[PDB]
Design a protein around this ligand. Sequence first.
Ligand SMILES: *[C@@H]1O[C@H](CO)[C@@H](O)[C@H](O)[C@H]1NC(C)=O
Ligand SMILES: [Fe+3]
Lengths: 323, 313, 652
Amino acid sequence: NERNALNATAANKVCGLSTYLKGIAHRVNSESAVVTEKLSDLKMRSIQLQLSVMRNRVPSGEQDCKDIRTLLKTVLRNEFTFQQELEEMRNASALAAAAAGLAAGRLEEWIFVFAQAAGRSSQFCISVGKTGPAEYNNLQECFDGTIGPETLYKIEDSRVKESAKTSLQLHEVLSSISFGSLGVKNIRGGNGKDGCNLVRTDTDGVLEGGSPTRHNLTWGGGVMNFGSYQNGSMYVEGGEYGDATEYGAVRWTEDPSKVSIFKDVIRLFARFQEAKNAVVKKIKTTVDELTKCIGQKEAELTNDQLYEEFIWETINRLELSKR
Amino acid sequence: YENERNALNATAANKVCGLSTYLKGIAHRVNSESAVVTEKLSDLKMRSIQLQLSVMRQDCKDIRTLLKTVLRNEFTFQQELEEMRNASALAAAAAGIAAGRLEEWIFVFAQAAGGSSQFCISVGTNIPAEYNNLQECFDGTIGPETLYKIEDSRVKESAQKSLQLHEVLSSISFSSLGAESIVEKGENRGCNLMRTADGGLLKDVCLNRNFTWGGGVLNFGYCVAGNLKIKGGEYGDVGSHDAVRWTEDPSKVSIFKDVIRLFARFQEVKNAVVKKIKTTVDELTKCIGQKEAELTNDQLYEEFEVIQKYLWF
Amino acid sequence: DKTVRWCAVSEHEATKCQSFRDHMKSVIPSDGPSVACVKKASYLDCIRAIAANEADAVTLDAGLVYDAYLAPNNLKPVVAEFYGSKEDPQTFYYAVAVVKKDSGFQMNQLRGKKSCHTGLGRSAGWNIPIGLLYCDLPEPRKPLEKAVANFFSGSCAPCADGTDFPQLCQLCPGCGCSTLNQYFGYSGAFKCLKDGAGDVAFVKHSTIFENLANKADRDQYELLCLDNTRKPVDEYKDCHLAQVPSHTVVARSMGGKEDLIWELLNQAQEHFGKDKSKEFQLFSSPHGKDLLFKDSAHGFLKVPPRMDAKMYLGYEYVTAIRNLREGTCPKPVKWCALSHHERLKCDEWSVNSVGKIECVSAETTEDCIAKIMNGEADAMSLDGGFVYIAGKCGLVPVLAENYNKSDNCEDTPEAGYFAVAVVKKSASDLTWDNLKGKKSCHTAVGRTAGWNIPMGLLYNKINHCRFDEFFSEGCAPGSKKDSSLCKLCMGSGLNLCEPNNKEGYYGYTGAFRCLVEKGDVAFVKHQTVPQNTGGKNPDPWAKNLNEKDYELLCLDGTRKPVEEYANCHLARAPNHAVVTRKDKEACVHKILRQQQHLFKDLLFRDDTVCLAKLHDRNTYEKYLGEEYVKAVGNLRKCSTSSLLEACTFRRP
Ligand SMILES: *[C@@H]1O[C@H](CO)[C@@H](O)[C@H](O)[C@H]1NC(C)=O
Ligand SMILES: [Fe+3]
């Protein structure tokens, strides 16, 4: 029987996904910074509205501006709730970060172990077509330099920080590792004699004088699925964790959203995104009500001059009552 | 003899999984520690509203700067709280990477079990370690769905264990485990995953390089055959072809250095924010009047709205 | 390409090699095998250069052949030097322990005796005896010299420090490392025993014959065997400490030019070998003695491909050196399983016995015998034909499978089962003689009833080994996949003609299935037709079969019903026996008897009523009987067993 290996094109797409998952930490940090920007703009506008009320500059009422009494009570209370929603949103931001960090660690340990499993006489576990071993020059999505623990990408590396800057979404990046996008010829590689045991569950493979018959060995969280007596030939078919048979083909995931580790990332990152969008909608609709009753004099007032003139007015309005 | 293939001991496996769930719990720890700071900040909002009520009613005499710094605080703090939450996401993510790296290793070893005699995680018997023996790794029958998720039961209660990161890291060092409790020596359990020599990872040849499980936890020379002679050392301490080395200093291991660095950072930012709030609270207090001081939180906010709506019109 | 980089360890060896290359170049064309030499500082830098793909081959003595097999070198024996006649080539020497007749002590009684050694640190005179007696030595076993001096009551170990270890020179004061010391070398070690100085001499099988020409003088001497018995000096092949290769060519286990080394060295011995050319001599050189190859060599022999270092050197040699190097000194039984079906059952047996019996899988029976031999596994149940092979490989039988209903099954020995030729009642044209050009169904090749008995009786007729020409087609699992004897098999793809249960026509039941579906004759045990017919087998194919529809082929061209087997059998077959490593008889016998009383033909034949004791029959010759051994011996010419070829390369 042929002895084949996992191909560098599969490994690189799996690593690409892992650096995207490390970047989720930076994605949630940037997205939250957009909301604090929107909320700071809301805080400014409410001082501008308060100034207009004191200076009697609030329009006679084009829209319903005649009830500033209530439409200011509600704004100062909505402003308080948004602060509690921001904190709930940030809690989800850290859970999404951790969950994605997990999925990445899992995938990185998988590929790294195959990358290291390489020796002389064209014996390897990661190929570059019909040859190998794949070195750091190949596998550039996985490594920074010659294969080792210190050449794997770390969370602050430029590669991770720059992947968080793209317009690519989780679903697109997940699909890049599915059996459909990849295909047999991008998963199986090597010559027919590369002696890779990590990819053989038949006797003398993962176990010596035996086979893992108790558990269907899965790498990733169910990305690459083995049975009990796989050749080592790297015969691949599309399928999930429960699909592998004893003598059949290795099952490569058809739907990466069905894998244990990605299920939580999708769920927790969705929870962040929903929470974030809902705060942004609310800030928008309250600012829609504010920008109506302000008046050009008070609308133009910006930054340091806004606090200056507001305190100028509060001290004058207090001495108006005191005299 | 040379064909001898040792298995990792279950107690060494559980200890790694223990660390792995402590690291998943770091997300809950940063979230909880961040919730304290908001309590400390809400007390500042309750103390500044207490001051404005006194203001609209010594050496506190300058009314202008009192309210100029009060409006300033409303903005200066949230942009430094943004800085601490940013550090919390990285510390939570970097921790999750280290958790996954250790999880894949142990889980793969746990799945490489076959009926009897050959397996990778041992309990001394000729039967591989099962979920009941790997209690800190799995919540039932061994599989991808039975490993602990970050919102899971024990991840949350691990996050409140009063154990520090440095202590949980020490728990998986060579000393803390002991030379005889890491690997089951003198036994042929056929685990090829711990063999770099020919007939191990590769079927006919030694590796061209060293190998590591974890990111420097378990380390092997390029041609490890037979009875594993474990010593304390790091990825760099693998000199010979025979060398097997388990970490003596977990803070020198690649994947943990960033957890230490980024958790320390978040704490550094969290402590800077905490002191700022304390120094502000202490300086506002000397201006607040006793009438407003003894005032309860509920009626304190009712009274503010009263003078607030008075001055507007 | 076709060049072999040979490793030379000196200046004089490197110039003989340039002469070797140049003389080869003068007699072999451009296309053919060529030599190129590489110079290195020592044999260890040579083993290292080969392993690091810098050089390709080097000739080594047994001690170095051991270091080359260990990791990270992983080298192996490929070609060997032979000495003496072409009829009996003397590839190996036998390390023996010579004594005087009636001194009345065994191997286990050596403590307190006076020993004679060739020299300190020499192979048969020191390394082998002391390596094997390692655990009989008193604590502290380090330094080794101190332990040896406190074991024996006086020695002569030349080249040892008498200032530090005086008991080691008691018989040759000074421990002189030259022939000036009367008791130095083989002749001196024998002289030390002859003069009555020592009580035992650690020498070679040849030494006595080189020192006493008279068979009546030699008669006053005996050898010590490892089984704690003595034998005549002329019985050294049956009574030795170790069997050691003289000088071996080694190469890389993977990507070592094994066939190109053989080609070059076979071509070399024909042109410049012993008494061939006036031009160049392969086994002589003006520049020195024993250059590249020993001068005494008569030529070369190919080492069988199945042969690995541990097997080539033997268990005894390996055991002695491991003990010297390691110093490691003080159940359960590892049962070998034949593929996933036997292993499934072996797993239930492992957990149920709760760590009394362990498992190991191998795809073939000879692969399993090889696991027993080295130590990867401890025991397995074998058929008569495989007991012959396994036994010839040094393994021994410990329990016999019993099939007859008895009062005390455990202690009632059986004469055996019967080998029969099964036909359909419908194929009435068939006679024992009318089988040419027909379809056969064998249990597997090398098996008693399935192969050795009918193919032996056929070989005594056609006087040739082309059985695939005799039959049209058939299924004999284990045969070459391109043979006509694999055409009727039912195995899926690669599993076709495989000697395990992955092949649906493997075994007694499998061969019977073959007869029903494709074949026209099946070779099995006498009880196969009754065990499957009349509903007894619930399988779809067998469910509706009745034994009235099958007949037996008698040797006298007669046909009789299946029940009339007693007077219509090909021959009596020896019962299946449980074989093991000699140094495991006791434990296997103990745990199997214990186990047996507590608890397809998986692991054991399904018609085993119990495992029965053996007595003086603890050898394959004794167990199988004089008659069966003779019949298997008549088939050596037709053998296809790569393991048998290997085992008989050491013990023919
Ligand atoms: C042994 O087997 C033969 C089979 O024909 C039978 O005649 C004999 O009586 C059996 N012996 C015992 C003791 O049952
Ligand atoms: Fe038989």
